[PDB]
Design a protein around this nucleic acid. Structure first.
Ligand SMILES: C[C@H](N)C(=O)NS(=O)(=O)OC[C@H]1O[C@@H](n2cnc3c(N)ncnc32)[C@H](O)[C@@H]1O
Ligand SMILES: C[C@H](N)C(=O)NS(=O)(=O)OC[C@H]1O[C@@H](n2cnc3c(N)ncnc32)[C@H](O)[C@@H]1O
Ligand SMILES: [Mg+2]
Ligand SMILES: [Mg+2]
Ligand SMILES: [Mg+2]
Lengths: 905, 905
RNA sequence: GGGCUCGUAGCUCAGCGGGAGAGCGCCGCCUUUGCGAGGCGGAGGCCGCGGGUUCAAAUCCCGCCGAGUCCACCA
């Protein structure tokens, strides 16, 4: 089945390679060396290159990049400069995980042409899955550059297939110098990004250096072929993908112990020299143990547990090192690398415009910051993360859209935030100890999953305090991952009951027209469809163009209009003319104008937002209703009043400039070349051609209706600024007359309030404060006076209290509300009275009982309830409740005596 | 002079067939066609005889006579022009159009501007308030009247026709109409008014001056060679024909009725009679006889008052054979129905042409006519409103007005509310003044109306009532009108101190955007620099001026303020003073000119809005830019509702969004007025044959100053304040553009701060204020209630703690409390039928009170107690108050209580 | 995108259906030479907003607002 693909490869059989199989029932693979065998012990060999350059000469990062790019430039394929590490153009995935991910999936589905063919690129990529592996395996990074050649093939016409792909790999390595006998081609199944295919993964010197995937299939519901839990289907067209790890590539050029040393030596050095590490990097014994341990690092990743300690023993003896000695170096190093790597990863994340958050894309950046800070704390680093990030910056020497200054601010803020959280969380744990005297796992998940507190802090406080502990691993995911239920399975929009072809809208090129000439094709329920619509349908925000539709008979009312694919729907809550009529649709001007203005204003505010705040801001979302509009952007903190005032100002300045607005349909490639990725702030559009709107400076892919110039949108008013989530901020605004009325309404609310207190609008806050102060004062004084009433009331009531064995009993029907009854009772109880008071209320009577002695006020109230038909409760000294039947004093006294008799001896 | 020129020159005066003669008593020269009969046509020599024997071939109607006159002179070669408004918008000397000549002075009459056409013919409505007293009495005088007139302008050169030809045209019409050549008499006299004047000939037919033909060749001047009514008048280069025809007097002399009112608007006169308190019947024949005879001689008696009038009224009363005391019964109220109806007419034209009643300006004249009319209504006890009569007029005439009827109705209803309200408080003043003064004087009367708004007749009524003599001269309404009817000069500090320079140059008219210029500086006097060319802006307003600096090779010169004089620029400078004849590049601040641009254009769009929303009575009183703000004054009869405020703002902002072009250009005065109407002069009146027309949208105005190109350039408008300073004129404070945004941000800040201090969302602030308020009120009443309850309760416990003697509860205690406590409890003790004493060790002397709800005297106890503790006091039979030096034990108080009770009763 | 956690005195919190409470901070007094505090007091609160439940809501339920936190779709 699958093999039929692999054996077809030309290079393997004719040029000089063979296919073989392993002892463990794992897989097939290819070699040119007919001589030697893997032991049969799972991963028998991990590395050879360590201590031995397998390249002809040590390369540096830039050198490797250029050697690769030009080797490939000379040979017939176009160079394309890298994409950002953030998948702005995609929705399905946050960050760039592979080189192929750049062009996915419109280009890979044939929908759009690649910018060149074949092409090549050193594309940075981020994987966060291998987080456990990183710093321990010696070959993994969170952030790396993956370089590629991609050839895009259509049925009958293909630049190249498998043969040139494998060829290029073999010739590239050979030009470097590694003999064909030393390169091993492992076959494997490759899936990811909605596309997939079989892949030859090149390992040399024991290290996977490369992977070339042959994309034959795509993710699809039918899913005849199944893999990685996902469903896939054979394509009509095929694409080649080629991943080459540079960081690993330079590593095999230097033969250093770990890739980290090969890529950023100086950073690792800075960390180790300014830390709490016991040892020195220089001396022999730590050099020997690192050399040999590095050799087995590629093994230790795959094998863990009992074997891990066993292999640790094997290498410990190999170097002649105690059980405690080696991991005394291995463990701190495993953290040093992780920290060094993460800092490099932080760099690209922030620099490419990703803003830390508590959810969504930004949370990833936050996470990396968090971990970096934990590691920094554990190493007692004498520097701040910013220093390390700056080092990586100089070292790689790249240039970013986001300034390093903003990066520092973000690091400082995120750090300070974390410090706040660990503080508050810590204090909580202390309270938890005092309350429960022991820590349990079910609470432990809450500590991390809902307070962001690592178990090492919980256990590291409980043990610090002697509190009981249970630390169960492998369960952190157990609850969050395994309980989750989706509601709807089928497609997003409501599917048609019948198809209509040739639907189109000519409001794109021309927006001055509300009017148009057309014919009608279809009618369903309370909503109808036509052939050419000036009618723009409603978005998530109201985005709706009202109007009417004249018939050849009468004027019929469009109350609302939506959209289906290749269809425009017009909801009419009145009579339906049916298929017969030939019709001119006439759209209301005021709405078209207002929506135009709010669209253009949306763009203007975005433009103003980036210029005032920084390049790191990107539209997270946007929606609009009647007399209101909103725009979500990425910013690490709610702006100060100054900052938003200036934003308002600059926005209005942009209005008064009255700059021209131009929008032109175009193919995706040319647009992407022209403007950068700021084009996709409004989402990613389907189709071969896109509608490009240019508001003079800010350019974006928008299907929305727009003004001719900016002078038309009128003034712009920011209505409300709120921080949705950390790192995302919503701006509520209005423009045109929808703003002036929004202002006028605002004026009203002021005047009205002023008029109520008969005072000048300017002095409203000062008078309202004065009142509020007086209001609190008066509210208090009443509480004092009410206490006086009660105290006086008590003494009045005891004077007439019948005595009962040196106790004074009181039972009356008073004139007071429940709170007064209660305060009175509390006073009587304090003075050792016994009895109950009642008061006429509302559809009920309020009962209060009381005792200042051994007698329980609750039991007395239940007895009162039996005679008066009602229920309540309270404490030993007072009890509150309600009854339906008011009682005479005599009847109440009967009961009290009956109660008092029960309880002496 | 002007004998020889016009007694013989004209073909009519000697050739055609006519003769002059003078009468010794008359002291006048008249021009007659029948030598057989001599007559004077001005009292006391002649009374009219035409009435009852209509001298025209046919009676006419107002509409028929008007168009007939027009088409005559049209066919005779004149150009027709529509009526001018009854308010002098086009000039500054006065408020109201005195004559047809008034329409064209001083700008056409001084040859500064061309006439609309030549020759021309109009039916121009005029108000003349000097003859106000004569209205109703003479039966020929009217306050408001169409003057039919034909004009032609002749400079020292060409001419349309001359006096021979004009008197030719008038005899042409007259003879055509049925009046004989022979009877018509031409009375020689001067004619003055409105800064112009000349020798005139008054055409009289059947004892009534019907036409007036004035030839003017002079102009008012300080030389004033010729003395004309104390006014100095001197010959003008150009010469000009000015005619006058009373349309009324024509239709009057055509129908042959008794009093002009009875033939131009009989319907009004009859209806007032029908709904007044007049006792007699107009239909009745005997009264038709006496009016007919009274009307024959009404002309003379109108100009006679006192006892001389009584003799005239006797001389007529006899010739009919009716008694004087009876005759008063028709003449004194029927002249009053005449006055009200004519006034009502005058009200229609005054208000219908954009007047709004006020205590100053032409609104004063409108108010006057209304107030007097109201007074007449009460003198007739009319069952109607004035508006009924006004509407009747509007129908009768068929004229269409700028100001609609609904508005004039509202004005009138309000004015009557004012009137009754201002006589109610004005009435006491006459009660004190009449006996205080013992007699009534002219200045007293004038002071009464002009200050206290008390019409003459009320004052006279009480003066007669409380035995005080009254001297009411003839034409006193001439006094009140004349004294206030001059448009104030509003003269300001002017300084054109000698500099020997005539013609300067300003470059900012054509383009405001430019901000830099270069020129040669001539003239330095004192501080102020002056120049040949500049781009700065002067104003004596005290604002809207430009500011800046100048750099030459010498140094920098800072101009803080810039002024003007006799058309010459002024540049104040503190710092370095420049050298004459220096090349200097002038630079102004952009923003200062920018604000001013924004304000100026915003003002004009405001006036536009106010006119569109409220009415066509909306004009201006002034405009100033107090720094950091702005203000506009507008004629309106009441404070605008907040709803109206909202729609002013909304409409004007709506226009701002529209961004309509704002064009400036020069235009001929006659052409501009022909194209736009007299709204053009709302900002004032510009001189010259050409004027700087400004268009800010629909609104057209003649302000020479900076402006913005488009409405959008001034952005949102905000309305700061609204106030009434004097009746009729309402003031708006407004900001636009940047200051607008500052104001709104301030508005929002207040609202946000109030909402903040009450922990509430701003949109719910008003409702949450009234709750807090109502709570602050309720809890406030609540407090005193509780304090009263404390007192109520406290007396009740003391009755219990008391002792019994004579079955009367005696209570004597010491308590720690102030005075008002001791009183507010003693009253309740006596109210509960108790007797006793209470004491308090207050700060300083001890406080003591006594009380008795029985027949015992509270005061007496205090006498006794106070004799033992060393102090006295006082009280009543129920309670007694006292202050004393020593506190007492309870048991010692019981002694004085017991002793007392024992001694009395 | 999906869960969970928390809003109470200035701060840090406990109270989780029938009294608004503790530590620290603040104010006063007392004792103390152990200048640090100790003893006895006092001030300080719409228990975040809207509702529903009940005789009764700081307390229970639902919604909002705000502040937190983890996980989530990567040969
Ligand atoms: C291109 C294909 N879609 C693909 O992604 N194949 S791959 O996942 O195996 O990656 C190819 C090369 O990228 C590099 N690479 C992958 N994951 C890495 C990591 N976590 N750290 C450093 N390099 C990595 C390796 O050199 C690897 O051979
Ligand atoms: C034409 C010249 N400028 C002029 O105004 N002469 S005048 O003062 O006598 O008025 C001209 C005509 O207006 C009419 N008229 C003047 N005063 C009037 C009044 N108080 N009421 C009614 N008509 C009047 C007379 O018909 C008169 O002939
Ligand atoms: Mg708190
Ligand atoms: Mg409670
Ligand atoms: Mg202390």
């Amino acid at each position: 089945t699958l093999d039929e693909e692999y054996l077809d490869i030309t290079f393997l059989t004719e040029n000089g390679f063979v296919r073989k199989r392993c002892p463990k029932c794992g897989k097939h693979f290819w070699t040119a060396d007919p001589e030697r065998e893997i032991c049969g012990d799972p991963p028998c060999e991990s590395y050879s290159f360590i201590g031995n350059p397998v390249f002809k000469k040590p390369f540096e990062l830039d050198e490797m990049r250029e050697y690769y790019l030009n080797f490939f430039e000379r040979r017939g394929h176009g160079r394309i400069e890298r994409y950002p590490v953030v998948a702005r153009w995609r929705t399905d995935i946050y960050l760039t995980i592979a080189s192929i991910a750049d062009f996915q999936p419109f280009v890979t589905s044939g929908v759009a042409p690649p910018p060149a063919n074949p092409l090549t690129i050193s594309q940075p990529c981020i994987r966060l899955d291998d987080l456990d592996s990183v710093g321990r395996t010696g070959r993994h990074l969170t952030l790396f550059e993956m370089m590629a050649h991609h050839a895009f093939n259509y049925p009958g016409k293909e630049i190249y297939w498998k043969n040139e792909t494998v060829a290029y790999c073999t010739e590239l390595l050979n030009e470097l110098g590694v003999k064909k006998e030393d390169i091993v081609y492992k076959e494997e199944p490759w899936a990811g990004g909605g596309n997939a295919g079989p892949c030859l993964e090149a390992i040399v010197g024991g290290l996977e250096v490369a992977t070339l995937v042959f994309m034959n299939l795509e993710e699809h519901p039918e899913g005849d072929i199944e893999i990685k839990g996902a469903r896939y289907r054979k394509m009509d067209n095929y694409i080649v993908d080629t991943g080459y790890g540079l960081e690993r590539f330079v590593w095999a050029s230097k033969g250093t112990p770990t890739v980290y040393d090969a890529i950023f030596p100086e950073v690792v050095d800075t960390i180790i020299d300014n830390s709490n590490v016991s040892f020195n990097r220089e001396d022999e014994r730590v050099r020997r143990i690192v050399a040999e341990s590095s050799k087995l690092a590629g093994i230790m990743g795959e094998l863990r547990g009992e074997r891990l300690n066993q292999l640790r023993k094997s290498v410990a003896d190999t170097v002649g090192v105690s059980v405690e000695e080696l991991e005394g170096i291995v463990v701190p190093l495993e953290k040093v690398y992780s920290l060094a790597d993460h800092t490099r990863c932080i760099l690209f994340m922030l620099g490419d415009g990703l803003v830390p958050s508590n959810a969504g894309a930004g949370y990833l950046a936050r996470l990396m910051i968090r971990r970096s800070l934990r590691l920094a704390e554990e190493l007692e680093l004498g520097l701040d993360l910013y220093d390390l990030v700056e080092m990586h910056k100089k070292i790689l020497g790249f240039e970013f859209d986001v300034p390093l200054s903003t990066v520092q601010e973000i690091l400082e803020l995120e750090k300070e935030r974390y410090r706040t959280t660990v503080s508050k969380g810590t204090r909580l744990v202390e309270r938890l100890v005092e309350r429960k005297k022991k820590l349990e796992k079910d609470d432990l998940i809450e500590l991390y999953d809902s307070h962001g507190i690592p178990v090492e802090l919980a256990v590291g406080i409980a043990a610090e305090k002697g509190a009981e502990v249970e630390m169960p691993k492998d369960i952190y995911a157990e609850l969050a991952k395994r309980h989750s239920k989706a509601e709807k399975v089928q497609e997003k929009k409501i599917t048609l009951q019948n198809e209509y072809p040739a639907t189109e809208k000519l409001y794109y090129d021309d927006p001055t027209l509300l009017e148009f000439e057309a014919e009608v094709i279809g009618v369903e329920g309370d909503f109808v469809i036509l052939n050419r619509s000036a009618f723009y349908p409603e978005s998530g925000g109201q985005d709706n163009d009202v109007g009417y539709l004249i018939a050849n008979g009468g004027k019929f009312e469009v109350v609302d209009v939506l959209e289906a694919d290749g269809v425009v729907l017009h909801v009419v809550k009145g009579a339906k003319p049916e298929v017969g009529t030939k019709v001119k649709g006439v759209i209301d001007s005021d709405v078209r104008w207002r929506h135009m203005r709010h669209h253009s204003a949306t763009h203007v505010l975005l433009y103003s937002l980036q210029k005032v705040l920084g390049n790191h801001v990107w539209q997270a979302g946007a929606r609009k209703e009647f007399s209101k509009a909103r725009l979500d952007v990425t910013h690490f903190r709610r702006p100060s009043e100054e900052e938003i005032k200036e934003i308002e100002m600059l926005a209005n300045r942009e209005i008064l400039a009255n700059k021209p607005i131009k929008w032109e349909w175009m193919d995706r490639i040319e647009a992407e070349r022209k403007f950068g990725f700021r084009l996709y702030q409004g989402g990613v559009p389907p189709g071969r051609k896109i509608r490009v709107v240019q508001v003079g400076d800010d350019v974006q892919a928008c299907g929305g209706t727009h003004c001719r110039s900016t002078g038309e949108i009128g003034m712009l008013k920011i209505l409300k600024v709120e921080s949705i989530q950390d790192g995302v901020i919503r701006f509520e605004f209005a423009a045109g007359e929808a703003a002036i009325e929004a202002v006028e309404e605002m004026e009203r609310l002021l005047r009205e309030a002023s008029s109520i207190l008969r005072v000048e609008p300017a002095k409203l806050p000062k008078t309202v404060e004065r009142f509020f102060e007086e209001w609190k004062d008066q509210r208090k004084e009443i509480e004092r006076l009410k206490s006086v009433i009660a105290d006086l009331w008590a003494d009045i009531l005891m004077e007439r209290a019948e005595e009962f064995d040196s106790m004074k009993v009181v039972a009356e029907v008073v004139d007071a509300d429940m709170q007064a009854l209660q305060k009175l009772a509390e006073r009587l109880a304090e003075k050792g009275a016994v009895g109950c008071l009642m008061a006429k209320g509302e559809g009920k009577v309020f009962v209060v009982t009381f005792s200042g002695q051994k007698y329980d006020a609750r039991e007395l109230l239940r007895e009162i309830g039996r005679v008066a038909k009602g229920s309540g409760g309270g404490r030993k000294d007072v009890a509150q409740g309600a009854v339906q039947q008011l009682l005479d004093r005599e009847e109440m006294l009967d009961v009290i005596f009956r109660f008092l008799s029960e309880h002496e001896g």
